DNA sequence: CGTTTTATTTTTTTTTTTAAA
């Protein structure tokens with residue numbers, strides 16, 4: 001796998017955040033300590049960190065963001081497991097900051113996967129409108145447990161088979177209830 | 193003889209022919225044909241100096257030089273032009289090494305500009321894949337829409353994370369991706385790939401050759417990835433391009449197709465400082481004839497009250513701001529606006545047409561033909577889902593341009609009162625139920641104001657005449673008179689001059705030399721590296737003479753000044769300093785105000 | 799060597815326009 005580059009960027013990620021970060025102590029455990037209530041999953045980490053100790057390997061981080069962000073979310077979980085009384089129920093939310101860096105005109109195809117900083121106003125907005133993003137099912141026959149990622153926009157209820165060659169259009173209706181999903185909102189925003 | 197089955201074109205011929213042409217090149221205009229012209233090396237080698245040394249990529253270049261060379265190149269370039277043009281780029285990408293072999297040869301060039309058109313009204317089956325260039329005026333300002341080029345795959349077991357780009361639309365499927373042992377079935381995902389940008393805005397053809405009682409017919413095309421907002425939209429512009437066509441999805445139940453093909457044009461290019469001649473720049477400033485000399489140039493034939501060409505003095509050597517870098521407060525913009533008042537069919541459009549025929553920011557307007565609210569971009573019905581957008585206003589697209597306005601006391605109260613602020617504030621608060629902001633735009637104003645009457649009624653000081661009060665009628669510095677000399681004396685002159693403009697059949701190059709372009713460049717230098725200040729000298733005049741400015745205010749049916757026109761005076765201060773060679777304030781300039789003002793301000797007899 | 803295809807209407811707010819002693 002190529003993206004093991006970013007997993008090593010994710011090794012890099014761990015390497016300083018578990019180790020001495022600032023102030024003679026931790027920066028990123030009181031977040032971790034606070035997340036336990038709903039399994040809150042929200043954590044902010046400085047991007048200057050990828051300059052303090054990663055030594056300007058931001059360009060080993062700052063390009064493959066939506067590519068490897070999932071893996072960074074995996075790192076969040078791998079952090080939590082190392083000391084918290086844990087089962088892998090921990091999900092993803094990573095909310096980087098500290099980027100001395102600031103626009104709509106500096107946009108192209110080319111700008112995918114970065115962490116630029118922009119500000120706008122509040123207008124023309126929409127409410128909470130959740131998404132039961134994960135879920136379970138199978139084909140016509142038997143294999144009724146799928147903890148997979150059904151969340152990519154290309155998702156579909158009927159699948160082909162798990163253990164045996166089954167139908168290819170049939171579907172079960174399954175565990176949308178003892179599992180983990182999300183919530184989100186949506187707006188319009190205008191140039192500062 | 194190595195060619196597409198259905199064509200007659202080959203890479204090597206055009207490549208070699210053009211490489212010889214650019215080796216048959218010293219600037220063949222300025223070194224072979226226009227030997228009386230001269231910049232003596234192949235310009236493209238010169239550019240590979242003046243591009244690489246400039247380090248300033250994405251060249252622009254024509255190919256009308258090629259008429260001297262073998263015209264078969266011209267033709268097969270005219271007709272097969274997406275399959276020869278990269279070959280001429282390849283020749284350039286070879287020329288790199290003529291002048292720098294071991295460069296950072298990692299960038300590419302952009303690029304024609306030679307062939308003709310007449311109009312868009314009527315074209316033909318023949319004219320299908322051919323080179324065209326046409327012009328008009330722009331309508332819209334679009335957004336961007338990108339376009340894909342490749343598939344980035346996934347896997348199930350052992351990370352068969354394959355990849356491959358697109359010809360234009362397919363990826364193949366054996367049981368796995370690039371069939372690697374088929375541990376799982378085929379995979380695809382569509383994001384970690386190559387994408388490509390474009391837009392769409394249309395043009396309105398606006399020549400003097402527009403057929404009789406005919407409507408606008410208008411054209412449009414996308415961009416490519418560098419040709420994307422080159423464009424302050426809405427002005428007189430040419431394009432090059434390649435006529436394109438496309439079939440259409442009949443109906444929409446299923447894959448049926450149309451008989452009729454829609455068309456647009458391929459997306460290429462658009463159309464619009466010297467240390468050499470420093471001499472005359474200083475020569476014209478130190479010559480006191482600035483008062484009239486260039487002013488004498490503007491009306492080419494007309495003296496029409498040439499104290500108005502001294503009113504044209506008001507106008508150019510460009511216009512300095514007292515922007516507020518010290519304190520940051522108050523945004524004191526140095527705006528300029530004057531009108532040309534009516535009661536006689538005088539040249540109050542013709543000058544405004546001379547201007548608009550010259551300046552590109554060209555518009556003509558007047559009351560009762562259009563709305564006051566043409567800053568709207570109306571949503572009468574749209575190609576959207578009622579996501580009601582007011583894309584771009586019209587009357588405000590004159591960014592430091594001009595809209596000419598005629599017949600000014602023509603409209604209702606809402607019209608022409610609505611604008612009581614933008615004049616010296618350039619703000620347009622869009623506080624409606626839709627999307628909201630405080631926008632910016634500022635420009636120049638001139639019109640042909642008219643009172644309730646045809647002739648200025650005698651016996652009757654001017655504040656009585658127009659139906660505006662002695663705050664709003666007496667508003668500006670001066671809104672300038674236009675009378676007939678009440679006698680034959682003035683009358684026959686321009687008759688005698690320009691009766692024979694048909695019959696003169698010539699033009700006289702006098703000591704008031706018709707400056708072909710030697711004028712048009714100095715003004716462009718007129719604002720660059722000297723910066724008019726205001727110290728302690730030329731300001732005490734109407735500091736003190738505000739006595740004289742306002743103490744005529746004791747009076748009704750007479751009029752004094754009000755404290756926005758003193759601003760117009762400190763704005764008058766800016767122009768004359770650099771030219772005549774003291775960028776710090778000289779005192780005479782205020783006289784120009786009195787030369788202007790009391791020409792109709794102490795004409796307050798009663 | 800078999801077994802299946804395909805429809806939407808009324809009200810808003812803007813910018814246009816239009817009415818009586």
Ligand SMILES: Nc1ncnc2c1ncn2[C@@H]1O[C@H](COP(=O)(O)OP(=O)(O)OP(=O)(O)O)[C@@H](O)[C@H]1O
Pocket residue numbers: 494495496497533534535536537538539540541542598599640641642686
């Ligand atoms: N001295 C002059 N030299 C050249 N042209 C003149 C002169 N005096 C008058 N004219 C002509 O008179 C015409 C005046 O009419 P134009 O169409 O500009 O009227 P206007 O200014 O719109 O009239 P109004 O403002 O009263 O409605 C101009 O076209 C101009 O050619």
